[PDB]
Design a protein around this ligand. Structure first.
Ligand code: MG
Ligand code: MG
Ligand code: MG
Lengths: 352, 406, 593, 307, 387
């Protein structure tokens, strides 16, 4: 049909061969690698940024176009090694993984460290540097200082989420920036070239909202494909109402509607909490005072007189679903109770 | 009869697939066509089903997988793996279960992989696969949440179609995730609040204990459905139904209430009665603490009245054994002249009996650092429970009540 | 050597290969009086202290085995309940309270292990609180010792071992340090073992160092109701060791009243310790053999009398100068003074007759005292004393009839029933039978017809019989001549060696330096710098600095009177008098006396 | 005044010189009597007003020449019982090695003296009431040393109320015999004059003054200073990367339930700086050090003995 | 052999909920009760009576998870008929699905009874939710029983669980206790005589004790005392007044001695078959600790609530010289004797600031212990503590 191809292009696994809006970073990283692969010298680079920036696809484009150059006899041929930091069980296994990738030998962690030491053309990539932290803090310090040698002839590209880690460790620094309005609009238009499946104002509203909150492309493609599903329900063209339903489906906090659908005694429990705060003025309170106000509230409403075990079941039911913040229940009648949500959200939920 | 007990005990306790779904039409509709996109096509999606305890999450997922499983082509080439948050508490327990339940344990054998992701990638390459994660919130309390990343990454990036469905009681589930696993997680939320009122709940009560139409003896089923039709409009049933609806809107409490009602039907009493449901509701709503206070001795009650007067005069300040004993001595020496003039270590043993049952707690628990006396304790009862349980005591003397009022 | 910036400088005799050391007798002797006398007396000292040490070790061994016997019999009674289906039986425990000290508890429990291993069980084990923090370690070590006496081990795994080897004896667990165990481990071990006791019998030995209330504090009533407790346990040890050391005629040396009055007043006042009573006697027997050269005679009579025959003239002169002998010779007849002092051969031969007169006074004294103990303990009021050590002090101090104490003792003993006297004389006859070689064999006969008589006239005789016995035989030992060769009375020297007092001594030197600096320094100002700072104190530092200056100059530019004041404050602070405070520059008076 | 100025000012002379002179030979007479009692299983500790250092020094010249004897300076600020047992094991005994615990060292020494009586050791202690040897564990080790027959001991006490350390069980170990030696020799060697009224202070703080200034303190402040000690100790293994950081210190202290606000930590650092405990090197281009200059082995000894 | 008395409604409810073998029952029933109301007895006799294949496992025995799971697995394996080892809850459930498919166990309700279940909530966090949902996880018609002393509201973890039907066993009344005790009767006398003894024993011990086990143990020990008037001949079976007059003082004395377990039962049955300065230091420390410092000069020279108050040693020696009417020298031994009492735990040093110049001691001893020592040396503590 029409929207089936829209879902095929909008799915995130269909990465384009050329990503729009990050051409200067591709050129910068390409010239950085080209200046050191040609002369057989080594260095190091640190990249970071929020997870919605597009670092993996861009570095894959850089690596790919270097194999395209290397097959054309432009640059000296190089072996590619890759490790991802998140995907390993214990942090020492990066050494033995590079050892398996480079030569046929397999060993333990410290023996891999020693053979890496005695051995040190290749281009290493280390994504997700954050989990190689130890209290000994040896691993990343190795990962920077091995290429700074004559025998190394290798380059290391490090990727993370916070630019304030290389200092604590005690290097060229690049920064992937959060996305704006126009770049997100251009990439949504670039994935939708030869298809008349959307009117442009839906793209406008979704791009403006995701640039308002976070600025990630994964949110963009998820909201737009969910709106494509919403268009599949209402049977075309995806109007503004479908995207407006999608965004307050997947971005709104459902705490107030969780309050509103509950039973009478749970809302009376929250009334007892707010009435006790208005009598006191603090932000935490014992179960005894909430129970004391709740007996008076149940007397005034006309509900039958509640026992401590029944209201305790009520309080445990709220505490399981994190609408309150409560201690483990092994002590009783002296649970200090505090809200997780603001007071005005609760007062808006109970007025209707 | 035997068969009505068999079918209704299959309905309530071992919660069984029954075709009726209540007020979840939009949610079941969306989840069902989404599973058909993942089933017939190569689309890969991720949803957490979010709702409180006992609101029908396992029912929804089992009904949807069964109704999907009826279709032949998805029946041939879909393998299911069910994981619960209570069994697998480590990334290794989880890995072992996923390699076992796909029946590639002979395929793996002695092979050693570099990484967790290499293991899962070698596993899945030997066809759509559906993953179901009961109790998703305890996978957010591991060391690194490596399982959650290695599920969402292969869902979102890998060509192998993966469906990941989550079940969770914590409403703040997008606040315990790390930022990166949040970034690859599509925020598709399906909310099963108990979105129904009291007449709908009366219809639930009517429908849930009505025999099916595949029962062999038809006339007994007709008379039984007419009987529960009659009990649906009875006001005595609706008063306890209104009370237990006021406590909660969960249907598992209704299942327990109906099971405690069904327990009292025999061949001697062939049809249910309103007083049966009244007895079941009285059995469910007993209060524990006053019941424990009912089973105490007279000296125990005198200690608790003395400790109540300590918490009324010395207002939220802790206490030890000796102040309690001097208050009790003040009761015996003037009011109960010569009555209950017990010695010191018997009152000590009665105090230790109270501690044993955990009605009195230490504010600071330091075992052996100080002796038994001069150690600060707090009362774990309300005054109104003490008055209520004292009014229901089997043989309570006049003077202990006269002290209890004054 | 000793002043450099480290705290361990050790001299070794290197570069001189002469490792021959100094003799111990060369360190003991120091004078030119008699050397060979001083090297035979200390072989005598060594032999007597070997006899003392052997006598003490045996005394204690008897008392120890006596206690273990009471434990063995109890262990056979409670297993009879297992011999006769758990019927909710309890676990027997025995509370074996030892002494205050912990160092000898290794030897006490070592003797208990071999006592139980022969009599009750072939399986007995001991457990330690150091190596049992939790139940998993506690149950790990317990199966390791039972298996040697013959993997997540359990109490169920314990009982399967019991049917492996028995296919009847109990197993005994010795908790030697019950106070040191954790509270959680002891509560859990009782409950797990009580449910499986009918196929695994249990008997527990607890080591209670403190008062036995410590069972209740660690173990609550909910857990201690599953156990049946029995208690198993100074003054009785003291009167035992006095009678088999001092009162025996077996051993030659004695001690005086004031040596004894020191050694009893340290025991029953401060600490009920029999071991420092031995510490007193090893000093008291020491200073006798060193100070007096004629201590070589203090032996058994065959060895003593041969030593008189071979003596130096100086040592014979020392016998001539014995103050007991000077009063012997003055009352002696007019021909006999010139016989002894001029002739060393007459002087020697007089001694063996005097030494044997002295030695038979050792045998006639105590058998009267043991007999007099039997009348006095049978008396109800206990006037002179209730124990053998209280009669011995009050008789040796002065003649007891010379005091008015014995007059009331005779008055009470005169009026008694016949069966009481028949009870006493049965005891009094077997005391005579207990000790042979009697030189009061005549009085051994006389009480036997007094026994054979069994009314007002006849019971007056036997009361007068013991009354005439105490006049004839019991006398203070100073009356007999040549007593000092076997006696030692250095009272205040013995007092100064043990219970000395520093807080008198530091207070003494500061207030009155005229005691120890006899150069007319004080009669009721001319004082050293340490003392001046003390008396003026009995307080800000600058007023104390000024008033120190007017005193030291009244006895006399000056800057040293503040420099003297700096040392007099600083040494007074190393001592526990002054501690700096924040109200003034300083304000402290913690001596307060 | 200065401490070095007071050591240089040594021109004073004793007034009663001849009167105090006769109080050396009088107590020199009792040397052989002391030798006779000690050799047979006793111990002697001397109680008096002035310093007994010169009397025991005269005792070691006149009597203890042809013997294997060791002298302990308890008045030395760096003294410990582990030091004296290691000294005996390495110098008196010919063993060369390291031992797991000092209780096993006490057991090894006792076991060695059971098998052989040919060794005799004269154990000389100039002061036993000094701050470092006051603990009941230390004198428990000493009492288990003292009870044997091949070990002979001499000691002194100075404090007004000295025997609050040894009890009935401990004086069963120590076979005390007591003697009056109340000379008026001044405590020239034993008064180190540190932390006195004299304002002059020399070098880093020794162990005793460090414990004395840190025990009269808030326990949260003690925890803060122990955090500083362990952090400087884990940095001082190598001369590079030494240096704490105020912001890192605030992060580490606020990670615990120790401090609420940064101004309270500023008050803490000024409270340490008034006693010259912290050395503030903040503002340095490399790192804002904020380290402590106390000797690191003394710091390990303080942290291991703080409770 | 086994009879249960005054448990008729609860037994009927249990057998109604258990139903037939092929029926499906609850996943969890939780039972709370008092310290002895036949929580173990009723369910264990009732699972022996109907022949339901069941495993009875104590939790206090199983202080680790591995012991608990291997114990339940081996007991159910013996019910089927080498050794079964599982380390995790996952392998427990997998091998439980492996083992229960035997021919006897296919279509009946398997029971796992866990008594003393209050030691599970300290074990791990994931174990109690693991057993509360066992029917849904394993799918093999399995019912789980919980026996405890603590109410269910103290058992809930933070994240909520499958709620059981909570079940209550009532306390025994005086009539029910009388009827239980008068069943296992002594054959050599009449039952009415033994019932009169149970009646007078409940007339003595009901006010303090409602517990079954202690009351039966007291009846067992004090029965040989009761039957001596009829053996000797002064009384007979019908003279109830003489028996009560003879026996009341014995049981009134037995509460202070036997019930507190000061004197053990063996010595009680054997008795019925057989018919210096440390004293003053411990006065000085207790007068220092329990007395304010501002009143020190009035009592010596011329509360018991809230615990002790620490005192200095300078005050301690100042007290000690004022009571003892003699010249007492501050020797080696008297300072050596104070530090013996701290080794006996009668006194305690507080603060640990310094050793010799730390005066801070604390007096951990009761009032009555001092009053016995003071009577020995004939001294009045009452005049000196307070007015
Ligand atoms: Mg990435
Ligand atoms: Mg579920
Ligand atoms: Mg039980």
């Amino acid at each position: 049909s029409v929207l089936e191809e829209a879902r095929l292009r909008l799915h995130v696994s269909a990465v384009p061969e050329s990503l729009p809006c990050r051409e200067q970073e591709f050129q910068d990283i390409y010239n950085f690698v080209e200046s050191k692969l040609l002369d057989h010298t080594g260095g190091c680079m640190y990249i970071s940024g929020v997870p919605g920036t597009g670092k993996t696809a861009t570095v894959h484009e850089v690596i790919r176009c270097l194999q395209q150059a290397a097959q054309a006899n432009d640059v000296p041929p190089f072996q590619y090694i890759e490790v991802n930091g998140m995907k390993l069980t214990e942090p020492h296994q990066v050494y033995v993984q590079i050892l398996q990738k480079l030569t046929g030998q397999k060993a333990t962690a410290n023996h891999a460290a020693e053979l890496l030491a005695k051995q040190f053309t290749t281009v290493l990539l280390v994504d997700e540097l954050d989990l190689l932290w130890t209290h000994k803090q040896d691993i990343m310090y190795n990962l920077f200082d091995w290429p700074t040698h004559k025998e190394a002839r290798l380059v290391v590209l490090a990727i993370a989420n916070t630019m304030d880690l290389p200092e604590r460790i005690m290097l060229t620094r690049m920064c992937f920036q959060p996305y704006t309005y126009s770049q997100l609009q251009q990439i949504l238009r670039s994935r939708l070239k030869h298809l008349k499946a959307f009117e442009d104002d839906a793209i406008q509203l979704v791009a403006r909202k995701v640039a308002a909150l976070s600025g990630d492309a994964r949110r963009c493609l998820d909201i737009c494909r969910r709106a494509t599903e919403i268009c599949e329900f209402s049977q075309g063209l995806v109007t503004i109402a479908h995207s407006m339903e999608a965004v307050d489906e997947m971005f709104s906090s459902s705490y107030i509607t969780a309050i509103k659908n509950s039973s009478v005694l749970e809302q009376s429990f929250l009334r007892a909490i707010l009435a006790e705060f208005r009598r006191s003025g603090l932000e935490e309170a014992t179960f005894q005072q909430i129970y004391s106000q709740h007996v008076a509230l149940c007397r005034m409403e006309g509900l039958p007189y509640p026992t401590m075990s029944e209201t305790m079941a009520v309080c445990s039911h709220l505490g399981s679903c994190r609408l309150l913040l409560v201690e483990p229940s092994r002590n009783d009648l002296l649970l200090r109770v505090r809200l997780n949500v603001s007071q005005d959200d609760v007062l808006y939920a109970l007025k209707d | 009869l035997s068969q009505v007990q068999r079918i209704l005990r299959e309905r309530f306790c071992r919660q069984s697939p029954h075709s009726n779904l209540f007020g979840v039409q939009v949610q079941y509709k969306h989840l069902s066509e989404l599973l058909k996109r993942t089933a017939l096509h190569g689309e890969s999606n991720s949803v957490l089903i979010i709702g409180p305890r006992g609101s029908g999450k396992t029912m929804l997922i089992n009904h949807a997988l069964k109704e999907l499983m009826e279709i032949e082509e998805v029946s041939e080439n879909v393998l299911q793996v069910h994981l619960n948050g209570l069994l697998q508490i480590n990334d290794k327990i989880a890995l072992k279960e996923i390699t076992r339940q796909l029946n590639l344990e002979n395929v793996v054998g002695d092979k050693v992989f570099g990484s967790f992701a290499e293991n899962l990638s070698f596993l899945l390459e030997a066809c759509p696969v559906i993953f179901i994660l009961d109790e998703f919130d305890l996978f957010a309390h591991h060391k690194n949440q490596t399982l959650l990343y290695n599920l969402f990454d292969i869902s979102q990036s890998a060509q192998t179609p993966i469906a990941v469905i989550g079940l969770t009681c914590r409403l703040d589930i997008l606040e315990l995730l790390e930022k990166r696993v949040k970034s690859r997680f599509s925020h598709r939320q399906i909310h099963l609040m108990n979105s129904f009122g009291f007449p709908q709940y009366v219809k639930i009560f009517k429908e849930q204990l009505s025999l099916p139409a595949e029962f062999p003896d038809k006339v007994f089923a007709e008379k039984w459905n007419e009987n529960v039709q009659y009990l649906s409009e009875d006001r005595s049933v609706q008063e306890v139904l209104q009370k237990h609806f006021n406590i909660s809107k969960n249907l598992r409490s209704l299942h327990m209430l109906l099971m405690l009602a069904l327990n009292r039907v025999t061949a001697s009493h062939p049809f249910m009665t309103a007083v049966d449901l009244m007895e079941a509701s009285q059995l469910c709503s007993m209060d524990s603490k006053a019941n424990i206070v009912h089973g105490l001795s007279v000296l125990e009650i005198c200690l608790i009245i003395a400790m109540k007067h300590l918490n009324d005069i010395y207002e939220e300040e802790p206490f030890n054994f000796q102040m309690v004993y001097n208050e009790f001595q003040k009761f015996v020496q003037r009011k109960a002249h010569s009555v209950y003039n017990f010695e010191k270590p018997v009152v000590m043993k009665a105090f230790e009996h109270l501690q044993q049952l955990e009605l009195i707690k230490p504010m600071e628990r330091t075992s052996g650092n100080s002796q038994r006396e001069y150690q600060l304790m707090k009362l774990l009862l309300d005054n109104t429970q003490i008055m209520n349980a004292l009014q229901k005591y089997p043989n309570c003397p006049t003077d202990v009540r006269q002290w209890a009022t004054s | 050597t000793s002043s450099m910036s480290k705290g361990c400088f050790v001299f070794k005799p290197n570069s001189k290969k002469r490792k021959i050391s100094l003799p111990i007798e060369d360190y003991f002797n120091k004078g030119k009086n008699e050397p060979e006398d001083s090297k035979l007396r200390f072989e005598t000292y060594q032999l007597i202290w070997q006899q003392m040490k052997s006598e003490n070790e045996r005394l204690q061994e008897e008392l120890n085995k006596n206690l273990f016997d009471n434990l063995i019999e109890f262990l056979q009674k409670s297993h009879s309940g297992f011999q006769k289906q758990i019927k909710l039986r309890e676990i027997p425990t025995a509370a074996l309270v030892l002494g205050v000290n912990v160092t000898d508890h290794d030897l006490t429990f070592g003797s208990l292990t071999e006592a139980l291993q022969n009599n009750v069980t072939p399986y007995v084990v001991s457990l330690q609180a150091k190596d049992c923090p939790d139940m998993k370690h506690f149950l790990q070590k317990l199966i390791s010792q039972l298996m040697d006496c013959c993997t997540h081990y359990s109490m169920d795994s314990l009982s399967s071992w019991y049917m492996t080897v028995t296919q009847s004896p109990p197993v005994v667990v010795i908790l030697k340090d019950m106070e040191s165990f954790a509270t959680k481990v002891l509560q859990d071990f009782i409950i797990i073992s009580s449910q499986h006791l009918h196929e695994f019998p249990l008997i527990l030995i607890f080591g209670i160092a403190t008062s036995p209330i410590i069972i209740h504090r660690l173990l609550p009533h909910a857990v201690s109701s599953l156990l049946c407790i029995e208690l198993f346990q100074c003054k009785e040890h003291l009167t035992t060791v006095l009678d088999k050391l001092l009162l025996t005629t077996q051993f030659p040396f004695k001690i005086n009243e004031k040596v004894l009055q020191v050694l009893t007043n340290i025991f029953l006042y401060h600490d009920f310790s029999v071991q420092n009573f031995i510490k007193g006697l090893q000093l008291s027997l020491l200073e006798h053999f060193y100070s007096q050269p004629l201590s070589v005679l203090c032996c058994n009579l065959p060895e003593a009398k041969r030593r008189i025959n071979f003596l130096s003239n100086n040592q014979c002169e020392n016998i001539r100068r014995l103050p007991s002998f000077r009063r012997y010779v003055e009352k002696q007849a007019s021909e006999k003074q010139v016989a002894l002092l001029t002739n060393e051969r007459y002087l020697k031969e007089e001694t063996q007759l005097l030494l044997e007169n002295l030695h038979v006074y050792h045998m006639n004294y105590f058998l009267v005292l043991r007999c007099l103990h039997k009348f006095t303990s049978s008396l109800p009021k206990y006037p002179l004393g209730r124990q053998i050590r209280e009669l011995y002090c009050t008789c040796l101090e002065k003649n007891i009839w010379d005091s008015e104490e014995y007059a009331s003792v005779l008055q009470l003993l005169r009026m008694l029933a016949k069966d009481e006297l028949m009870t006493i004389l049965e005891k009094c006859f077997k005391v005579f039978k207990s000790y042979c070689e009697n030189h009061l064999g005549s009085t051994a006969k006389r009480i036997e017809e007094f026994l054979a008589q069994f009314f007002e006239v006849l019971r007056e005789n036997v009361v007068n019989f013991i009354d005439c016995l105490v006049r004839e035989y019991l006398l203070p030992p100073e009356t007999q001549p040549l007593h000092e060769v076997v006696y030692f009375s250095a009272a205040h020297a013995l007092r100064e060696h043990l219970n000395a007092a520093p807080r008198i001594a530091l207070h003494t030197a500061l207030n009155n330096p005229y005691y120890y600096l006899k150069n007319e320094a004080l009669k009721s100002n001319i004082a050293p710098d340490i003392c001046i700072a003390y008396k003026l104190h009995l307080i800000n530092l600058v007023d104390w600095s000024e008033a120190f200056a007017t005193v030291v100059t009244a006895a006399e530019m000056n800057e040293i009177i503040h420099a003297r004041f700096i040392r007099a404050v600083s040494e007074l602070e190393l001592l526990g008098f002054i501690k700096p405070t924040k109200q003034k520059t300083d304000h402290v008076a913690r001596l307060t006396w | 005044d200065q401490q070095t100025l007071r050591n240089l000012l040594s021109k004073v002379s004793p007034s009663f010189s001849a009167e105090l002179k006769q109080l050396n030979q009088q107590y020199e007479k009792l040397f052989h009597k002391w030798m006779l009692q000690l050799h047979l299983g006793f111990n002697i500790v001397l109680y008096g007003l002035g310093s007994k250092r010169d009397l025991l020094e005269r005792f070691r010249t006149t009597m203890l020449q042809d013997s294997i004897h060791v002298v302990i300076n308890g008045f030395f600020p760096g003294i410990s019982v582990k030091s004296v047992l290691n000294s005996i094991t390495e110098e008196v005994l010919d063993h060369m090695g390291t031992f797991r615990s000092i209780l096993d060292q006490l057991d090894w020494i006792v076991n060695k003296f059971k098998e052989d009586s040919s060794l005799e050791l004269f154990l000389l202690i100039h002061n036993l009431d000094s701050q470092m040897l006051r603990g009941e564990k230390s004198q428990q080790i000493i009492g288990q040393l003292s009870s044997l027959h091949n070990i002979y001991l001499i000691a002194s006490i100075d404090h007004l109320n000295a025997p609050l350390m040894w009890d009935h069980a401990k004086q069963s170990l120590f076979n005390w015999l007591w003697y009056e030696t109340t000379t008026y020799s001044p405590y020239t060697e034993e008064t180190s004059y540190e932390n006195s009224l004299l304002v002059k202070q020399s070098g880093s703080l020794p162990l005793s003054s460090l414990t004395h200034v840190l025990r009269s303190l808030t326990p949260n402040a003690r925890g803060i200073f122990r955090l500083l000690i362990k952090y400087q100790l884990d940095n001082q293994d190598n001369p590079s990367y030494i240096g704490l950081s105020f912001q890192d210190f605030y992060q580490q202290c606020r990670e615990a339930f120790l401090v609420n606000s940064d101004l309270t930590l500023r008050a803490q650092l000024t409270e340490f700086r008034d006693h010259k405990l912290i050395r503030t090197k903040k503002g340095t281009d490399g790192v804002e050090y904020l380290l402590i200059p106390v000797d690191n082995g003394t710091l390990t000894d303080f942290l291991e003995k703080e409770e | 052999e086994n009879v249960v008395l005054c448990r008729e409604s609860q037994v009927s409810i249990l057998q109604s909920l258990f139903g037939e073998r092929h029926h499906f029952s609850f996943p969890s029933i939780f039972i709370y009760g008092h310290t002895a109301s036949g929580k173990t007895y009723v369910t264990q006799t009732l699972l022996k009576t109907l022949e339901l294949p069941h495993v009875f496992v104590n939790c206090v025995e199983c202080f680790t998870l591995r012991l608990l799971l291997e114990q339940i697995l081996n007991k159910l394996n013996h019910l089927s008929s080498t050794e079964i080892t599982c380390e995790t809850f996952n392998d427990f459930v997998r091998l439980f699905k492996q083992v229960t498919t035997a021919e006897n166990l296919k279509d009946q309700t398997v029971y796992i009874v866990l008594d003393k279940a209050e030691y599970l909530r300290d074990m791990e966090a994931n174990l109690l939710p693991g057993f509360l949902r066992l029917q849904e996880l394993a799918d093999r018609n399995v019912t789980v029983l919980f026996l405890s002393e603590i109410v269910w509201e103290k058992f809930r973890p933070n994240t909520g669980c499958f709620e059981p039907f909570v079940l209550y066993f009532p306390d025994y009344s005086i009539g029910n206790l009388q009827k239980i005790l008068s069943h296992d009767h002594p054959p050599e006398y009449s039952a009415d005589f033994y019932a009169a003894y149970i009646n007078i024993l409940l007339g003595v011990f009901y006010t303090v004790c409602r517990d079954l086990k202690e009351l039966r143990h007291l009846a067992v020990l004090n029965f040989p005392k009761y039957c001596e008037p009829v053996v000797k001949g002064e009384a007979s079976e019908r003279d109830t007044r003489k028996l009560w007059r003879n026996i009341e003082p014995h049981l009134k004395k037995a509460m202070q001695t036997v019930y507190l377990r000061e004197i053990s039962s063996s010595q009680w049955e054997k008795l019925q078959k057989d018919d210096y300065y440390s004293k003053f230091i411990l006065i000085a420390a207790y007068l220092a600790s329990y007395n304010p410092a501002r009143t020190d000069k009035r009592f010596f020279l011329k509360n018991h609530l809230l615990g002790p108050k620490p005192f200095p040693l300078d005050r301690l020696l100042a007290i000690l010289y004022s009571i003892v009417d003699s010249r007492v020298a501050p020797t080696a031994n008297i300072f050596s004797q104070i530090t013996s009492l701290v080794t006996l735990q009668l006194l305690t040093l507080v603060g640990h600031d310094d050793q010799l110049d730390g005066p801070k001691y604390k007096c951990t001893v009761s009032l009555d212990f001092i009053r016995a020592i003071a009577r020995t040396v004939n001294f009045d503590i009452i005049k000196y503590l307070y007015d």
